[PDB]
Amino acid sequence: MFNNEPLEQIDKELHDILADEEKRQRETINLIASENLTNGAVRECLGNRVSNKYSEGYPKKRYYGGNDFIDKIEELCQKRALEAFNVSDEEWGVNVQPLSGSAANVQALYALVGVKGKIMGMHLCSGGHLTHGFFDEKKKVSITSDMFESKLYKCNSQGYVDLDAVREMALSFKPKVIICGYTSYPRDIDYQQFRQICDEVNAYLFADISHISSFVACNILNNPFLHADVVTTTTHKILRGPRSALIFFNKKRNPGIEQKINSAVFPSFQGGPHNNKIAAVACQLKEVHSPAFKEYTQQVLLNSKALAKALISKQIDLVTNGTDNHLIVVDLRKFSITGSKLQETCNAINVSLNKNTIPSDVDCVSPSGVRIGTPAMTTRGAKEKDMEFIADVLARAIKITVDLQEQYGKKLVDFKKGLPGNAQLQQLKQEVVTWAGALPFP
Amino acid sequence: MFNNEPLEQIDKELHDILADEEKRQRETINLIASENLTNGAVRECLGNRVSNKYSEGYPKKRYYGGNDFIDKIEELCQKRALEAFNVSDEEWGVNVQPLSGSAANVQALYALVGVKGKIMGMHLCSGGHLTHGFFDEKKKVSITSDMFESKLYKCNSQGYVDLDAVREMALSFKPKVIICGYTSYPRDIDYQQFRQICDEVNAYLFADISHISSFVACNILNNPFLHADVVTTTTHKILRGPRSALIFFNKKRNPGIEQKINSAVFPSFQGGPHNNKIAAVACQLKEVHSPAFKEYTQQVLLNSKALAKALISKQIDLVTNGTDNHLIVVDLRKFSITGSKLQETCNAINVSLNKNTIPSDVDCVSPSGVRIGTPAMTTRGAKEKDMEFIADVLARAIKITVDLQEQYGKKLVDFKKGLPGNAQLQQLKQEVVTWAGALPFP
Numbered sequence: 001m002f003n004n005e006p007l008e009q010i011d012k013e014l015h016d017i018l019a020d021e022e023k024r025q026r027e028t029i030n031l032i033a034s035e036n037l038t039n040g041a042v043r044e045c046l047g048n049r050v051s052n053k054y055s056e057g058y059p060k061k062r063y064y065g066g067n068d069f070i071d072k073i074e075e076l077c078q079k080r081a082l083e084a085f086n087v088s089d090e091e092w093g094v095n096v097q098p099l100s101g102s103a104a105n106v107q108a109l110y111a112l113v114g115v116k117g118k119i120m121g122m123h124l125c126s127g128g129h130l131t132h133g134f135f136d137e138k139k140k141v142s143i144t145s146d147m148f149e150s151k152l153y154k155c156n157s158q159g160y161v162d163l164d165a166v167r168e169m170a171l172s173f174k175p176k177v178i179i180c181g182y183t184s185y186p187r188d189i190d191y192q193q194f195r196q197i198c199d200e201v202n203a204y205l206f207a208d209i210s211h212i213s214s215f216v217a218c219n220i221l222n223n224p225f226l227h228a229d230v231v232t233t234t235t236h237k238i239l240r241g242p243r244s245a246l247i248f249f250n251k252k253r254n255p256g257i258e259q260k261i262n263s264a265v266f267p268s269f270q271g272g273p274h275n276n277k278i279a280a281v282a283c284q285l286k287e288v289h290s291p292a293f294k295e296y297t298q299q300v301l302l303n304s305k306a307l308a309k310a311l312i313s314k315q316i317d318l319v320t321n322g323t324d325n326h327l328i329v330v331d332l333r334k335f336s337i338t339g340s341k342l343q344e345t346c347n348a349i350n351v352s353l354n355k356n357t358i359p360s361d362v363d364c365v366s367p368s369g370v371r372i373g374t375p376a377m378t379t380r381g382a383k384e385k386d387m388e389f390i391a392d393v394l395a396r397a398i399k400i401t402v403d404l405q406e407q408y409g410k411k412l413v414d415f416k417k418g419l420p421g422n423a424q425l426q427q428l429k430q431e432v433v434t435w436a437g438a439l440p441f442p
Numbered sequence: 443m444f445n446n447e448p449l450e451q452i453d454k455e456l457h458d459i460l461a462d463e464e465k466r467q468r469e470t471i472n473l474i475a476s477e478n479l480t481n482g483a484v485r486e487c488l489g490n491r492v493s494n495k496y497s498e499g500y501p502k503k504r505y506y507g508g509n510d511f512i513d514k515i516e517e518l519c520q521k522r523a524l525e526a527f528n529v530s531d532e533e534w535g536v537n538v539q540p541l542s543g544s545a546a547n548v549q550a551l552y553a554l555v556g557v558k559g560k561i562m563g564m565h566l567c568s569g570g571h572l573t574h575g576f577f578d579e580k581k582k583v584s585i586t587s588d589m590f591e592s593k594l595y596k597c598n599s600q601g602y603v604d605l606d607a608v609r610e611m612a613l614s615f616k617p618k619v620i621i622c623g624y625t626s627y628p629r630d631i632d633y634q635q636f637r638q639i640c641d642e643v644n645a646y647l648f649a650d651i652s653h654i655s656s657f658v659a660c661n662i663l664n665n666p667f668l669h670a671d672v673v674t675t676t677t678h679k680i681l682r683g684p685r686s687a688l689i690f691f692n693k694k695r696n697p698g699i700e701q702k703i704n705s706a707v708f709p710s711f712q713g714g715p716h717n718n719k720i721a722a723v724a725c726q727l728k729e730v731h732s733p734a735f736k737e738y739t740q741q742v743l744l745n746s747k748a749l750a751k752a753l754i755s756k757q758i759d760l761v762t763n764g765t766d767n768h769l770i771v772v773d774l775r776k777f778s779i780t781g782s783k784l785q786e787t788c789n790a791i792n793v794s795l796n797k798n799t800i801p802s803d804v805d806c807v808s809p810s811g812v813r814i815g816t817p818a819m820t821t822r823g824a825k826e827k828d829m830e831f832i833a834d835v836l837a838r839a840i841k842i843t844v845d846l847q848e849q850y851g852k853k854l855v856d857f858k859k860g861l862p863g864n865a866q867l868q869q870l871k872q873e874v875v876t877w878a879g880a881l882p883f884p
């Protein structure tokens with residue numbers, strides 16, 4: 001007693017918009033550092049009928065029966081997860097049920113400290129995540145600043161994590177968890193030194209590696225598994241999975257953490273797991289452990305170095321003057337334009353990037369930089385040679401952005417009026433669309 | 443620089459388990475009251491490339507650009523949601539971003555009350571959800587008991603909501619929110635009287651209608667929209683959508699609530715929306731509003747009434763002696779077997795149901811009933827005439843369960859010893875398989 005008609009027939013209205021979405025993706029230079037493009041196999045898992053099943057609980061400890069094949073998949077996903085991040089199933093456990101990054105962080109923090117518990121993270125404006133305890137004088141913005149008590153540390157004037165300030169703050173504040181691993185941080189993290197500070201104040205070390213997960217897994221960057229009590233990661237960014245998250249806990253370092261983490265996810269926070277997600281994550285974790293994926297991850301870094309270097313050669317300033325990873329943050333101060341203006345201009349030429357604070361910015365009010373990353377364009381086949389064209393496109397956007405601000409004024413409302421119809425943008429947009437639309441597209 | 447091979451080639455190990463899962467579903471009499479089967483179109487959206495996109499924020503108030511088609515989809519989903527539940531966009535708003543039912547209840551509750559806020563709900567043992575403030579003397583089991591302060595009401599000896607006890611509690615406890623709508627309640631709710639209790643104590647009326655959403659939408663059961671401040675619902679049960687949730691809030695009764703709810707979902711709790719989920723929900727909400735789906739929902743109730751009637755004709759007791767909706771709870775006391783045993787027996791014959799407490803059960807330790815529902819089998823084309831065979835199959839399961847307990851004993855470990863190789867079960871399984879495997883299967 002159902003309608004078996006395909007999407008085009010059953011909902012022509014929606015299917016056209018989705019077809020448009022597809023076209024915009026195919027025709028965009030996507031520099032969003034947290035975005036990627038899934039392959040067809042991951043999307044087959046996501047549309048699988050496995051999501052019809054209710055599997056509250058854990059493998060072999062389910063509230064309902066008929067979960068034999070579901071258990072096989074959840075167990076397979078955990079095994080692949082632990083292998084991919086080079087950890088022994090005896091020393092490390094993993095939870096694969098969190099629905100997304102934010103949920104996993106909240107659930108994981110709660111497991112370690114509970115309500116009213118004390119946490120330290122990097123300020124949102126310095127490059128930490130919302131779920132790392134972000135708040136405002138005006139409001140407790142994230143639940144992680146409201147269900148917990150949070151202190152926020154900052155990067156120094158050159159954009160680096162200031163460990164001396166972290167220790168100082170940890171010693172007066174006495175937190176139970178200290179979080180590291182970030183949302184817009186262009187360099188590697190010294191986990192060893194974080195561990196040293198945590199030990200000195202008897203705190204958990206929490207590493208959020210969502211942005212760099214592929215680097216940790218492929219032994220290209222520092223390994224936080226050597227020092228962390230908990231490691232969380234999304235599966236949708238550089239990992240190239242579906243939208244989900246993993247939570248890693250070190251059993252050997254903390255007895256009783258497995259139960260704590262596992263009960264925090266269910267039944268403390270979530271109900272039924274989304275089995276299609278878990279299948280898709282399993283699908284991607286097989287690929288992550290291949291030698292071909294290490295090549296892709298290497299290439300992501302090669303492209304990021306090439307991009308930074310080309311941007312520098314065009315006299316564009318980078319926060320920390322470079323990158324160790326997949327992401328760059330441009331300091332736009334010498335051009336006297338805001339990050340928002342450049343976002344609007346790049347939107348108008350089919351280039352996706354976002355505004356991002358820089359150390360000099362007091363607040364997240366008027367961010368003076370943009371953040372770009374290479375995973376999505378590396379997925380689409382661009383190599384180091386192709387990064388010059390992108391740097392060239394960004395430099396032209398910056399120049400137009402300056403000319404438009406000259407002609408219409410600094411106010412954002414005024415500035416946008418300059419954008420529609422502008423001849424240069426139309427020209428630049430077509431170059432973008434012709435070059436972008438040509439590239440391989442899963 | 444990606445692998446485009448289909449799931450079967452790229453991950454044969456996973457594709458085999460998923461195919462077994464597909465076979466088990468096709469070959470099962472699924473009486474899980476919370477389960478259903480999605481159509482192909484809903485699964486086309488879930489596997490869509492729209493999930494590639496980061497779109498934190500709300501339509502037209504997005505942190506990133508390139509969100510034009512995403513905004514069209516999120517706005518279309520909210521519009522279709524409001525139409526489906528017979529509310530005007532001027533009086534009611536809805537949030538479509540919650541990743542699941544449990545996230546949506548936590549986010550909604552937090553919006554209304556905040557940390558340390560006081561809430562009332564039905565106890566889990568009496569049929570409430572975990573997210574309605576569930577706790578145990580041993581531990582604060584749900585975050586809704588730990589981040590809020592919660593009191594739990596009970597149903598009466600006949601399995602009905604005892605409003606007089608709810609009032610006694612509401613006046614003594616003085617909560618800010620009172621939750622109604624349940625996970626295993628076989629009758630309709632008197633929202634009018636819940637409203638009366640709420641008004642008396644200045645509490646919000648929260649209606650969780652996930653199990654009954656289709657009935658509310660099609661004007662078959664009482665409408666909580668006439669009285670409730672907030673209404674939440676999953677999209678995956680009787681609504682037949684993807685795994686997601688909706689939060690409805692009433693602007694006209696509470697000004698400033700749209701902001702409170704929207705801020706709770708993001709950035710308080712969630713990060714980026716899962717745009718494939720939103721697309722899938724859009725797709726289903728269209729269908730919900732058709733008169734074909736009203737027929738399906740009618741059929742669900744017809745089948746539930748017919749199943750109840752037949753179970754009674756076979757001398758089987760039902761909590762409240764019947765059902766006003768899609769679900770039945772069997773009281774097994776007269777057969778001297780537990781729900782756990784019957785679940786084990788039904789697992790062995792490819793019948794999916796779950797154990798459930800009854801009013802006489804003080805604890806969740808040994809629940810004395812099972813819960814069954816009709817949405818999934820109604821989806822597969824079962825009509826009233828087909829419920830006799832199901833009632834018959836369940837009666838035979840009960841009898842075998844009784845015979846097995848006689849032969850092997852009351853202890854669960856011993857009882858299971860009796861299940862494999864049992865001649866009767868294999869026979870009963872094969873009929874189940876023959877009849878189930880033939881039914882239409884989206």
Ligand SMILES: Cc1[nH]nc2c1[C@](c1cc(-c3ccccc3C#N)cc(C(F)(F)F)c1)(C(C)C)C(C#N)=C(N)O2
Nearest residue numbers: 124125127128129130183355356357364367498505709
């Ligand atoms: C959207 C999002 N999600 N997670 C994030 C961010 C942003 C970010 C968040 C916010 C933000 C979001 C919700 C509530 C309050 C605020 C504030 N203030 C604002 C900005 C702004 F600078 F562009 F204004 C930037 C950026 C990657 C986009 C961010 C940064 N910087 C960090 N670190 O993490």
Ligand SMILES: Cc1[nH]nc2c1[C@](c1cc(-c3ccccc3C#N)cc(C(F)(F)F)c1)(C(C)C)C(C#N)=C(N)O2
Nearest residue numbers: 056063267566569570571572625796797798799806809
């Ligand atoms: C799984 C689940 N999710 N949401 C739910 C439930 C159950 C339920 C939950 C639990 C449960 C789950 C997590 C933590 C503690 C407990 C306890 N006690 C136990 C049982 C049992 F009674 F069968 F043992 C039943 C059932 C629909 C399966 C439930 C009922 N009855 C209600 N009302 O809501």
Ligand SMILES: Cc1ncc(COP(=O)(O)O)c(CNCC(=O)O)c1O
Nearest residue numbers: 034100101102129182183210713714
């Ligand atoms: C370090 C980190 N942790 C957790 C999350 C949460 O992911 P969800 O949105 O899946 O909840 C993000 C998202 N990062 C936002 C961005 O870089 O654009 C992140 O950067």
Ligand SMILES: Cc1ncc(COP(=O)(O)O)c(CNCC(=O)O)c1O
Nearest residue numbers: 271272476542543544571624625652
């Ligand atoms: C009334 C109600 N509310 C919320 C939820 C939570 O949904 P998620 O599992 O998507 O978190 C459930 C799940 N009910 C479980 C069942 O009836 O089988 C529910 O029954």
Ligand SMILES: [Cl-]
Nearest residue numbers: 277488716719
């Ligand atoms: Cl999904």
